[PDB]
């Protein structure tokens, strides 16, 4: 899982910040995108994020995921 890889949302993941589904639940399963970042550190210092895999999708929309939630392609 390196910055750049194009992943696919395999696990069911419900969100509420989707531009076309604002404030309403929406499952991202089935969506494909690319890892914009893998939160683990900040300029050397340790980071404690529990949803590291950040993935950007169609247009202005990104979301964080747990490793098992996404699958490499």
């Amino acid at each position: 899982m390196n910055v750049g890889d194009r992943v696919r949302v395999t696990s069911s993941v419900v969100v509420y910040h989707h531009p076309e589904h604002a404030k309403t639940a929406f499952d991202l399963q089935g969506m494909e995108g690319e890892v914009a970042a893998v939160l683990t550190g900040w300029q050397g210092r340790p980071i404690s994020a529990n949803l590291p895999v950040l993935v950007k999708f169609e247009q202005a929309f990104k979301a964080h995921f747990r490793p098992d939630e996404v699958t490499l392609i």
Partner: protein, 108 residues
Amino acid sequence: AATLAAMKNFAEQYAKRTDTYFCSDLSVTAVVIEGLARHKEELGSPLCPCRHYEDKEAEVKNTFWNCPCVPMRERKECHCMLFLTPDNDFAGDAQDIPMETLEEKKAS
């Protein structure tokens, strides 16, 4: 504390914006706002209080845990139990909390 009021005013408005509710036991709610205000007065950002970090200065910069944190913005998952879905069991039907109820927490 001025910062406290700001964190209180935020929590109240955010809960209404995200349709979330405070814990049926406001004492828990007050404790979180008290922590948020504290962190904000120290780092400048209301870093999640109900957690342990190995570098709070960096966390604030990563913003992941800056209230409202990513899990809450994206999945409405508030680990501190501050913001709850009406569905939640621990959920109550209040979105406002008496300043007095907060002041009484600072006394500890």
